[PDB]
Design a protein around this ligand. Structure first.
Ligand code: HEM
Ligand code: HEM
Ligand code: HEM
Ligand code: HEM
Lengths: 146, 283, 146
């Protein structure tokens, strides 16, 4: 995907400060709290009954770390999101059967978490750049669904 | 809401469907599976081959419940209460997909009802399927709970005097992140620091302040605004989701301590409720 | 945009039976009835007060003929929708200020009209092909919105 120079710079500069483990646990956990129907994929994760249980759930933390780790790897290949995510796209479509709309919900929550964590530094132009990136990653993950 | 003219149209169309309801329900699913293949992720446990007994069986159950909704059009939440619970708590189908099946049900009826599917009946059927989808998704998160109201009132109180400033930031975020929304303000200077943007953000924020102060009586309190968006401004309902998102992003960036997961959830629910009221009179 | 040969064939085969002016007037008229907020662009068209007045309105008909004529011409360039509709995209974005969501609503109404007009000949596979095409046209018209 193509971004302006200023947009790419905005995205990579901020991501250098992101501790993927911490933000990853937080983004997945909020997804499960704010849009609880997304819990349908994580029945084996344990207690997800309340916000505090979700946020302290070590399996939630570890999965978020895994998910955003892969996302992170995607940012290093902004020029070819489809090719980078094709295998994981197949995985999600054919084995996990995850409705790609979940990728978009996760995108929305992720933007909220970056704003929460970084505050004033997450300016309107930086958000716009990230919105393009999370949309492009969701589209890349949805590509192999047939 | 469905007018009595809508209910008459729906009852006429569905009466004409009559005994083919099951068959039409199965056709709608097949059309859905073919046209929107992401919907198949909810049925990995089915044989989705054309004419499969599972698809036929589910088609008839879908149609039974619609017949039930038609026969209890004035009492829909009550009548579909068990179905609501099941989708909210068990199946947990993302609400986006209800729109896709409704569209395929509409295409199916059009293809089988040449004489009855007039423009006014089309509109009524569309409204009815949207109402059904609303009821079936109403317990996913439910109405605002007392914890939600408390959470919203605390977060907004903390916002206090900066409500106007935050409203302008949310608009700026919206214009930059979702450029299609700019088509509603061709008459504005949308540059950063624009006073038109600041003045409008203050109006938006003041209306939200009014809504928080009337959380239990929101439709009346927002009635003039509902009128204005429905009949004058005529903003496509999709756009309310985008501003809500940017309002949430704005609050997150300014409320480091207060924007907890629980408060985030309550705020998201609150803004969806506000958006629901503001679009309630469109149709 | 990518369709299979058989999808391309099925779309072009049915379109050969379309009276573009009639279906255009019908599809725009139904858009204005079913999603009345779309009337916002057409206050210079006169009486839109009732469904029958919308459907009988000569300016509505004329606009539908224009719109669906452009769509029609677009079907001859299924391999290059983006390029085919680029100037029209800029026009709707910069001068007409039409929210691209309207293109998606028109696509939904057009699918319904084709089913109504053609009945059983509008089979589930024929619909799937048209759904890709109407989404394709919407994305192409939305492309220049900045
Ligand atoms: C940016 C979006 C996403 C990325 C990059 C991503 C990436 C991944 C990766 C790397 C795995 C691990 C595979 C393995 O270890 O073999 C995985 C598995 C999984 N993902 Fe995704 N994911 C994303 C979004 C989602 C969302 C939103 C959901 C559902 C709400 C989801 C549901 C799952 C499930 C259920 C698993 C398997 C967990 C288990 O093994 O118990 N993913 N994902
Ligand atoms: C017009 C909206 C809908 C209605 C009226 C409806 C109604 C129903 C009914 C009557 C049942 C069976 C209840 C029972 O057996 O106790 C059911 C089950 C189910 N629904 Fe919904 N449904 C709707 C939309 C959807 C959508 C859009 C999806 C997903 C794409 C969906 C996914 C399912 C699934 C996966 C089942 C369970 C199938 C099984 O295991 O037998 N529903 N629905
Ligand atoms: C959270 C939802 C919203 C609220 C509470 C809200 C509230 C308001 C208020 C208070 C006004 C001014 C009324 C007056 O002049 O008396 C207004 C006007 C307006 N709104 Fe909404 N609004 C919302 C969302 C939107 C969205 C999403 C759009 C379109 C993208 C929009 C477009 C407009 C326009 C174009 C005007 C007129 C501005 C002018 O010409 O001065 N609104 N809104
Ligand atoms: C696939 C969808 C569409 C296509 C192919 C299309 C195409 C066109 C064309 C060919 C023109 C004439 C431009 C010229 O004469 O240079 C036009 C104008 C216009 N369109 Fe679109 N259009 C589409 C959708 C829409 C929708 C959904 C709306 C609004 C609900 C809309 C609103 C307008 C308006 C307001 C005009 C100008 C009317 C006039 O000046 O007489 N268009 N469109």
């Amino acid at each position: 995907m193509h971004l302006t120079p200023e947009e790419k710079s905005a995205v990579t500069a901020l991501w250098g400060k992101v501790n993927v483990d911490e933000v990853g646990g937080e983004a997945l956990g909020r997804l499960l709290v704010v849009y609880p129907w997304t819990q349908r994929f994580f029945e084996s994760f344990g207690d997800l009954s309340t916000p505090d249980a979700v946020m302290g759930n070590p399996k939630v933390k570890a999965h978020g770390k895994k998910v955003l780790g892969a996302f992170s790897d995607g940012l290093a290949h902004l020029d070819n999101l489809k090719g980078t995510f094709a295998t994981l796209s197949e995985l999600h479509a054919d084995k996990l059967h995850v409705d790609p709309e979940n990728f978009r919900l996760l995108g929305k929550v992720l933007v909220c978490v970056l704003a929460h964590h970084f505050g004033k530094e997450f300016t309107p132009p930086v958000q716009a750049a990230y919105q393009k990136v999370v949309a492009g990653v969701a589209n890349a993950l949805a590509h192999k669904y047939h | 809401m469905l007018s009595p003219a809508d209910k008459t149209n729906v009852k006429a169309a569905w009466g004409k469907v009559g005994a083919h309801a099951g068959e039409y329900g199965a056709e709608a699913l097949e059309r859905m599976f073919l046209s929107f293949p992401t919907t198949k992720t909810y049925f990995p446990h089915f044989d989705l081959s054309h004419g499969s007994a599972q698809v036929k069986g589910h088609g008839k159950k879908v149609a039974d419940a619609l017949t039930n909704a038609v026969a209890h059009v004035d009492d829909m939440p009550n009548a579909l209460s068990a179905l609501s619970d099941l989708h909210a708590h068990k199946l947990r189908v993302d609400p986006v997909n209800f729109k896709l099946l409704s569209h395929c049900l509409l295409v199916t009826l059009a293809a089988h009802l040449p004489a009855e599917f007039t423009p006014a009946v089309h509109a009524s059927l569309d409204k009815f399927l949207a109402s059904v989808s609303t009821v079936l998704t109403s317990k996913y998160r439910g109405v605002l709970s007392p914890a939600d109201k408390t959470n919203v009132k605390a977060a907004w109180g903390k916002v206090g005097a900066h409500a106007g400033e935050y409203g302008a930031e949310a608009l700026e975020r919206m214009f930059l992140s979702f450029p299609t929304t700019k088509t509603y303000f061709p008459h504005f200077d949308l540059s950063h620091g624009s006073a038109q943007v600041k003045g409008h953000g203050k109006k938006v924020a003041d209306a939200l302040t009014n809504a928080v102060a009337h959380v239990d009586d929101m439709p009346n309190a927002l009635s003039a605004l509902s009128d204005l968006h429905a009949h004058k401004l005529r903003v496509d309902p999709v756009n309310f989701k985008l501003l809500s998102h940017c309002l949430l992003v704005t609050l997150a960036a300014h409320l480091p301590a207060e924007f907890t997961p629980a408060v985030h959830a309550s705020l998201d629910k609150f803004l969806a409720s506000v958006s629901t009221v503001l679009t309630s009179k469109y149709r």
